Design a protein around this ligand. Structure first.
Ligand SMILES: NC(=O)c1ccc[n+]([C@@H]2O[C@H](COP(=O)([O-])OP(=O)(O)OC[C@H]3O[C@@H](n4cnc5c(N)ncnc54)[C@H](OP(=O)(O)O)[C@@H]3O)[C@@H](O)[C@H]2O)c1
Ligand SMILES: NC(=O)c1ccc[n+]([C@@H]2O[C@H](COP(=O)([O-])OP(=O)(O)OC[C@H]3O[C@@H](n4cnc5c(N)ncnc54)[C@H](OP(=O)(O)O)[C@@H]3O)[C@@H](O)[C@H]2O)c1
Lengths: 156, 155
């Protein structure tokens, strides 16, 4: 199966011109929990932002620039590179989420109570086509700059 | 001599109820550049938020980590640093307020972020401080806000 994992500010904003204006180690821990050694697919801009671990599959139209990870030139090649696994984790960014949302069976979302003027958004999903199977709200604290809610949705 | 090092949002905000809403690895690298192995003094809340050098923690209560040095007063904090060229006071608000009158140098990162804080860097009169270094940086893929490193020396 294919899953998407993303952290959304209000209006489904996921990315800005620069690094996101928050500090959420709990979200980093949740991201790790839910990826572990599973194959990940990401776009080239997300790869440049995160600086590797599992299979790391990077989408780019151009030849790859780091032989430690696997570079692919299409969605189909990305899926093929992950092989026959229980769950593929699509980790961003906006252009990649848009292409994989119709293929996805599960969303792992972190809803962050932050308003940020973004340039990239998580794709529109119709909540009626998705069953919320898990939800956990957390307050901001000494380590986390904003309140946040982890949610898992499974396609209906 | 005593120096303060701090990261200031607008209105001299240094701290909030919760973690600061920014991601500034360049400021962490600057903080390291300017501390390295020099003794550091910090308040107990800053200790809990963040050991390496001498790490001197102010608290009214017995210490809870024997890997660092705990002191109950400003004068003991200074004494615990020994005879060194530069003591780095790293926060927080209560600690900066007590050490500012003793300080000869400020290492400030001015961050272009507006945040409603609960704690501020102490008032200083810029006329009483000479800016000896200033370096501006844009936000980028790793740093959420633009920032300016500044070093002031007491005139
Ligand atoms: N998303 C884009 O295509 C694109 C283009 C120009 C500027 N930007 C800016 O970059 C920032 C991040 O955007 P984002 O979150 O959308 O980035 P992202 O998903 O992390 O990465 C997008 C990149 O992934 C590669 N890619 C995605 N789908 C592909 C496919 N089917 N075949 C081959 N390569 C594919 C392209 O790399 P290559 O560029 O190496 O081909 C693309 O530019 C935004 O501010 C956006 O405006 C994005
Ligand atoms: N981050 C956290 O852990 C946390 C938790 C609760 C509240 N706060 C609140 O957050 C706000 C900002 O704190 P801040 O930046 O001012 O904290 P800070 O300077 O990092 O730490 C202040 C602490 O340092 C100790 N201290 C400072 N001067 C001292 C002296 N002369 N003698 C003995 N002990 C001394 C006291 O510890 P003791 O308290 O151990 O005596 C004091 O509470 C404050 O309103 C604070 O009360 C922060």
């Amino acid at each position: 199966m294919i899953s998407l994992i993303a952290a959304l500010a209000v209006d489904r904003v996921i990315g800005m011109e620069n690094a996101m204006p928050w500090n959420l180690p709990a979200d980093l821990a949740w991201f790790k929990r839910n990826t572990l050694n599973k194959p990940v697919i990401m776009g080239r801009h997300t790869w440049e932002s995160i600086g590797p671990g599992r299979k790391n599959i990077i989408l780019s139209s151009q030849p790859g620039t780091d032989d430690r990870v696997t570079w692919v030139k299409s969605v189909d090649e990305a899926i093929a590179a992950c092989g026959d696994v229980p769950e593929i984790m699509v980790i961003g960014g906006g252009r990649v989420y848009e292409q994989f949302l119709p293929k996805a069976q599960k969303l792992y979302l972190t809803h962050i109570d932050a308003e940020v003027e973004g340039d990239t958004h998580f794709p529109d999903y119709e909540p009626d086509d998705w069953e919320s199977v898990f939800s956990e709200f957390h307050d901001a604290d000494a380590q986390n700059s904003h309140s946040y809610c982890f949610e898992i949705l499974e396609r209906r």
